[PDB]
């Protein structure tokens, strides 16, 4: 039976895990202690002998504090004590710490736990990995774990949900280094990536949800909504059930092109929802507006390559069809020459549930979009500009060389992502 394994690494990974596992327990109806007081429920929660279910996730962080918070929270009796792994010292915004000297102490322990989890599961659909490019742990440990995971399981899909550093705001200063040098792992040992920044979701929450002062949990609930919308087709029934492999094939044209764009709709509050009538046409029109991307880039300056639409609830194929036809009859939205058909529709029946104290209103229907498109080339163009502007003066390099990595890989990484954006320009070229 289909099973997905969660690989949450870093402080961000642990927090998104908190939100997503809260939503999973709620939607399946699981008590926080671990008891059950159509749906599949086996894909995430695994039975034990005493009639108690244990989540299929691994939380790894090189600082013990954030994991200890969950160890002393409400869900202390839900996660397996072996599942959550800690380190005494962190990487502290250093790829070299996260990759070359600190990770190797606990790599084998993490791999043993993952091996046990894979032996418990029968049919593993794939590995969903949550991390961030900025953090030392979230970059380095994810990179080494992914490169070992690739040789351990050659055919298992390895999906990434990653927090990209924002275009303007930053929680640190040395992050362009780590975001640049995690690209080799995320380019060759990956299948699809789901880069998000915090700035765009800040804007979307301020603008539509009316919460003027969002905090991190306001983002984490939205990310949990994203992942539940993704895996609803594994969880429940529907007319058109879709799978991880289904959308990997319908979303990756070339091996170097595996960075779709995340988008969610409708994202509004109760006062909005009570008087605004939500139709499939309106939600699909909102999901295409550039003011509704999770990442800071305008698709109007890029070109769409492929789209996965995931509808859920009281959704009807005919109004989906009218929505898609209306979307296609637009000069403003553009598609490449070699993709005459570029939509994959998946349908689920169970409407999205609501976390108490949340922000989204109770909606009958929901949609999610995963858009592989070329407008994200500018994001790494800005990243390359800032990386060169700092590396030209050899700033902060002594930390890395002292931790024990060599310096030619700096230029190697810069050349790598320059080649990436060159290939994206190649694809953006049209054969007219």
């Amino acid at each position: 039976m289909r099973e997905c394994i969660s690989i949450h690494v870093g402080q961000a990974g642990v927090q998104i895990g908190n939100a997503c596992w809260e939503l999973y327990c709620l939607e399946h109806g699981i008590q926080p202690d671990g008891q059950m007081p159509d749906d599949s429920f086996n894909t995430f929660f695994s039975e034990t002998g005493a009639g108690k279910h244990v989540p299929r996730a691994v939380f790894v962080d090189l600082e013990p504090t954030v994991v200890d918070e969950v160890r002393t929270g409400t869900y202390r009796q839900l996660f397996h004590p072996e599942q959550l792994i800690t380190g005494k010292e962190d990487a502290a915004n250093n790829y070299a710490r996260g990759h070359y000297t600190i990770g190797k102490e606990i790599v084998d322990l993490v791999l043993d736990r993952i091996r046990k989890l894979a032996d418990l599961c029968t049919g593993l659909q794939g590995f969903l990995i949550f991390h961030s490019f900025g953090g030392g742990t979230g970059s380095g440990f994810a990179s080494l774990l992914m490169e070992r995971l690739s040789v351990d399981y050659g055919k298992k899909s390895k999906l990434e949900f990653a927090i990209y550093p924002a275009p303007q705001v930053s929680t640190a200063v040395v992050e362009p280094y780590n975001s640049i040098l995690t690209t080799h792992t995320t380019l060759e040992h990956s299948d699809c990536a789901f880069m998000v920044d915090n700035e765009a979701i800040y804007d979307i929450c301020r603008r539509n949800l009316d919460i003027e002062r969002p905090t991190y949990t306001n983002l984490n609930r939205l990310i949990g909504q994203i992942v539940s919308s993704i895996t609803a087709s594994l969880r429940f029934d529907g007319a058109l059930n879709v799978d991880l492999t289904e959308f990997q094939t319908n979303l990756v044209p070339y091996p170097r092109i595996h960075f779709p764009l995340a988008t969610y709709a409708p994202v509004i509050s109760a006062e909005k929802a009570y008087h605004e009538q939500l139709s499939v046409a309106e939600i699909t029109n909102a999901c295409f507006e550039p003011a509704n991307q999770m990442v800071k880039c305008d698709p109007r300056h890029g070109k769409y390559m492929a789209c996965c639409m995931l509808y859920r609830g009281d959704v009807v194929p005919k109004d989906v069809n009218a929505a898609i036809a209306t979307i296609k009859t637009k000069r403003t939205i553009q598609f490449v020459d070699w993709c005459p058909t570029g939509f994959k529709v998946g349908i689920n029946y169970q409407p999205p549930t609501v976390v108490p104290g949340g922000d989204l209103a109770k909606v009958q229907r929901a949609v999610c979009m995963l858009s592989n498109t070329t407008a994200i080339a500018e994001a790494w163009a800005r990243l390359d500009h800032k990386f060169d502007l700092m590396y030209a003066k050899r700033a902060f390099v002594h930390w890395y060389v002292g931790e024990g990595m060599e310096e030619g890989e700096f230029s190697e990484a810069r050349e790598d992502l320059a080649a990436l954006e060159k290939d994206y320009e190649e694809v953006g070229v049209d054969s007219v």
Partner: protein, 427 residues
């Protein structure tokens, strides 16, 4: 005696297949338990064409349900007619195809086809005189377009004489729900042409047009679409099941309908489509059927027959009627629309009559048509195929499976050669 084996693959074929077994269980009067609760004798005389005898007055469908993912097998088991299907008839895989034609046809379908071949051989040996095989699947999936089109290659080698027809679901150009869709179809059409006696190309778009206009339902779900496909599935085989004034079978039309084994693609239609609101106000005669079935808006495929020439036409009538204006209206449509027929085949209309009506309707009719306009749909795939292929996009999924590059070229060469010689038969 004259038995029919229904092959069932993929999310598509499993759903309409369950829908098809729902319709014919109603007509023959079986409850979902398995007992015969019909009234007439003629309901139960030739039940053994689809149904296999079981102890205790039970009847089991003689169908083989396959899917590379186990989720649908729980769903069909959880349907209305869910318990009627034999647990051994469920053969299922753990990993889905990913809309990948290559994965279902060579990678993982290879290990499972022996399990499907096992049950079919026992299925074949159970019936005394099998009339042929029947398969419902999707040309745009990964299982039916993939592994299913592989099963066709094996059984045809195993059973040459028997007649097999595919109630396949073609993609529409106006609406699609898969980016890699032209890859599997172009890799599917190359296989059906080689070994298939006649093919009923079903379009999902025209069905939505039908329920919007002809039936004017506000929210027809997929189940209604499967019913109209299920209606056609029973309509073709009715003269086999029941007595008629002039009977027919799957060979009586397949022999009568194809002048050349290459030209085997068909366009199936259903006659009595009237809205629920004005059922009591409807008049039911031969003329209004003929005006209904030959209209292009009634059609279930995405080609306008006015843009092509009708080569051959087969129509099977359901309902106790007599033949005189049944024969006369076929002449009226022939001489009036003389331009829309080809001239080297005189009297190109084939009629067949069965005595029994369906439940709740005194009359039915099913139209099976070979037209030039079916060639237009194939060119629409090639225009989509070449544009994606010229950039070699989405190809490493197929490349990384051990496939070569030339199979994309030969399949393109085949159907281009098909529409080349199909076009010369228009002129």
């Amino acid at each position: 005696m004259r038995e029919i084996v229904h092959l069932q693959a993929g999310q598509c074929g499993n759903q309409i297949g369950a829908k098809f077994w729902e319709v014919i269980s109603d007509e023959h009067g079986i409850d979902p338990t398995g007992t015969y609760h019909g009234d007439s004798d003629l309901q139960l005389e030739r039940i053994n064409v689809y149904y296999n005898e079981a102890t205790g007055g039970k009847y089991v469908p003689r169908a083989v349900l396959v899917d590379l993912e186990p989720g649908t097998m729980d769903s069909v088991r959880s349907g209305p007619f869910g318990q009627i299907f034999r647990p051994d008839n469920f053969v299922f895989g753990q990993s889905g195809a990913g809309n990948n034609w290559a994965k279902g046809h060579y990678t993982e379908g290879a290990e499972l086809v022996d399990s499907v071949l096992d049950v079919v051989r026992k299925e074949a040996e159970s019936c005394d005189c099998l009339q042929g095989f029947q398969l419902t699947h999707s040309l745009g999936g990964g299982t039916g377009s993939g592994m299913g089109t592989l099963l066709i290659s094996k059984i045809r080698e195993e059973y040459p004489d028997r007649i097999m027809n595919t109630f396949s679901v073609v993609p529409s150009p106006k609406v699609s729900d898969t980016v890699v869709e032209p890859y599997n179809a172009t890799l599917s059409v190359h296989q059906l042409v080689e070994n298939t006696d006649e093919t009923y190309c079903i379009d999902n778009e025209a069905l939505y047009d039908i329920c919007f206009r002809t039936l004017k339902l506000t929210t027809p779900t997929y189940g209604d679409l499967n019913h109209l496909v299920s209606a056609t599935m029973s309509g073709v085989t009715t003269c086999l099941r029941f007595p008629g004034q002039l009977n027919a079978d799957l060979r009586k039309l397949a022999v009568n309908m194809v002048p050349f084994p290459r030209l085997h693609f068909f366009m199936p239609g259903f006659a009595p489509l009237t809205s629920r609101g004005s059922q009591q106000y409807r008049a039911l005669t031969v003329p209004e059927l003929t005006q209904q079935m030959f209209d292009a808006k009634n059609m279930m495929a995405a080609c306008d027959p006015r843009h092509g020439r009708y080569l051959t036409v087969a129509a099977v009538f359901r309902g106790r009627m007599s033949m005189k204006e049944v024969d006369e209206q076929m002449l009226n449509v022939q001489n009036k629309n003389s331009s829309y027929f080809v001239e080297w085949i005189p009297n190109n209309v084939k009629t067949a009559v069965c005595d029994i009506p369906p439940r709740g309707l005194k009359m039915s009719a099913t139209f099976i048509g070979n037209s030039t306009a079916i060639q237009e749909l194939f060119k629409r795939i090639s225009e989509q195929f070449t544009a994606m292929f010229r950039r070699k996009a989405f190809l490493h999924w197929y490349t990384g499976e051990g496939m070569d590059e030339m199979e994309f070229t030969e399949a393109e060469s085949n159907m281009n050669d098909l529409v080349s010689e199909y076009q010369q038969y228009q002129d």
